[PDB]
């Protein structure tokens, strides 16, 4: 049975959890303490020593969207990728976008003064971009159903909502400024399997709140 | 006939050129001046407004390794990806690695003091990592033949060799310190189609040299 090494609040782990849950693939979750990384983690992710690590058979697969693509080839049911190659490239483009531009959300969490200033601005340009170019008339990035880009961005934007509250004056992701994006994240959290596997906002705010004060 | 928008010295364009050449796919190269970006570029890459842009039919495909994956699905001859899904994830892992860690090479080019200091150190840890974990006993990342990770890293490391000379005291990518990597880049440049489509080092050194002084 496949193994997922990770830890609860990680956006990168929930990407993998969602893909596993969406495909109703059975797995064992291996709780990892990063201040005390198990020998398993150090053996199977020697390059980055990060989680998630996905252990299928004895082979390890490491970066989270890499794992989602792996999971998707090996377990084709409930496709996270379109069949057309242009649509597939489009889906990958927005995953890549989420990974690169989404780093602003995570710098935000640790930023303070003018540094916090800039990442909030950068976070805002990311959203403006997606809001105008990213999500078409279709309900999800993936069409009528959740795709890899929904996974990738869904973790960026939901964690952003929470990181915002944890920082305080976060006038960043405002629903009336970015209505199409808020409609999309609202629908994404509304999907039964995402709904069932979605960390409760309040708990996370406090968690990242008490984490930021330190 | 497919269109490739780009400009000569760009590592990201040569990724696409190599994939096109390796598959003997015919295309038109559209020279782009980035200080004066054509309306075509602004229309088909509104999100980043960067090159390369690959125009197949009327559809644009934008980030360079995204384009290589597109080219590879649409033109399956001379496969750049393995058939096994684990090997495929492995190949993607090292592409992703090249893209993330390779940014050190490109910060180097613009760095000066302690800033240059750090990126040279970071560049060195990237190489140490690949040198020990990246390339197995097999000749290429892709096995007996060039794969996507060879493409991705091949552009990082060759441009690094050149950027090194352009900066001066670059004691970074030393052949005796990283012999397995030097064997690999040596073999990569030795491949007939890469050899034929490889910017001449001397010209590029000067180009990046005169570019750095400014
Ligand atoms: N898989 C993620 C990276 C995941 C990641 O960065 N995880 C952190 C915590 S969420 C970690 O495991 N270790 C952080 C460290 O030790 O530097 C990706 O797509 O790049
Ligand atoms: N496709 C590349 C990015 C290519 C890129 O950054 N190109 C630069 C020059 S090599 C550009 O077109 N524009 C730079 C700018 O205008 O900011 C990728 O894989 O991210």
The token pair that represents B53 in the structure block: 């842009």
* Binding pocket residue ranges, ligand 1, CB within 6 Å: A 10, 12, 34, 50-52, 63-65
Q: By 3-state DSSP, what share of chain A in percent is helix, strand and coil, each rounded to 5?
A: 60, 10, 35
**Beta-carbon separation of A88 and B96 below 8 A:** no
Relative to the CA of B96, which ligand 1 atom is closest?
20
What's the CATH architecture for A3-74? 3-Layer(aba) Sandwich (3.40)
SS3 assignment, position B208 = helix
Nearest to B56 by CA among B66, B107, B47: B66
What is d(CA A158, CA A185) in angstroms, rounded to the nearest whole number?
Answer: 7
Report yes or no: B50 and B44 within 8 Å, Cβ to Cβ: no
SS3 assignment, position A32 = coil
Neighbours of A107 (CB within 10 A): 16
Under CATH, to which class is B85-212 assigned? mainly alpha
Q: Sign of dihedral through CA atoms B68, B69, B71, B72?
A: positive
Annotated resolution, angstroms: 2.6
In the sheet with B59-61, reading across from the earlier edge strand, the strands are B28-31, B3-6, B53-56, B59-61
Most B-contacting residue of A46, A80, A93 (CB-CB within 10 A), to test interface: A93
What is d(CA A39, CA B64) in angstroms, rounded to the nearest whole number?
Answer: 36
Nearest to B21 by CA among B88, B68, B81: B68
Report which DSSP code applies to B33.
-
What is d(CA A135, CA A172) in angstroms, rounded to the nearest whole number?
Answer: 19
| B46 contacts in chain A (CB < 8 Å) | 133
Could you tell me the CA-to-CA distances from A142 to A19, A148, B44, B73, B181 in Å, in that order?
13, 7, 21, 19, 39
The token pair that represents B44 in the structure block: 């088909």
Nearest to B126 by CA among A47, A210, A22: A47
Report which DSSP code applies to B34.
G
Report yes or no: B179 and B127 within 8 Å, Cβ to Cβ: no
- Spell out the domain ranges in chain A: 3-74, 85-212
Nearest to A67 by CA among B93, B133, B130, B82: B93
Experimental method: X-ray
The token pair that represents A139 in the structure block: 């309900």
Cis amide prior to A52 (ω within 30 degrees): yes
Among A88, A93, A129, the residue with its CB nearest the CB of B63 is A93
Q: How far does Cα A90 stand from its chain's mean position?
A: 18
Q: Does this chain's domain B3-74 share its CATH topology with B85-212?
A: no
């Amino acid at each position: 049975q496949p193994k997922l090494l990770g830890a609860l609040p990680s956006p990168f782990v929930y990407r993998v959890i969602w893909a596993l849950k969406l495909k109703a693939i059975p797995y064992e979750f291996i709780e990892e303490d990063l201040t005390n990384k198990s020998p398993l983690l150090l053996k199977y992710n020697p390059v980055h020593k990060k989680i998630p690590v996905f252990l299928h058979g004895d082979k390890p697969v490491c970066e989270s969207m890499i794992i989602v693509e792996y999971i998707d080839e090996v377990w084709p049911q409930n496709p996270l990728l379109p069949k057309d190659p242009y649509e597939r490239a489009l889906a990958r483009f927005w995953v890549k976008f989420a990974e690169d531009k989404g780093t602003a959300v995570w710098r935000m969490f640790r930023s303070k003064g003018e540094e916090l200033e800039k990442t909030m601005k950068e976070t805002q340009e990311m959203l403006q971009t997606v809001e105008e170019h990213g999500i078409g008339e279709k309900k999800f990035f993936g069409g009528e159903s959740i795709g890899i880009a929904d996974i990738a961005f869904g973790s960026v934007v939901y964690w952003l909502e929470v990181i915002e509250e944890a920082v305080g004056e976060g006038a960043v992701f405002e629903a009336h400024r970015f209505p199409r994006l808020h409609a999309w994240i609202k629908d994404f959290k509304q999907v039964p399997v995402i709904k069932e596997n979605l960390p409760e906002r309040d708990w996370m705010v406090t968690f990242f709140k008490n984490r930021r004060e330190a």
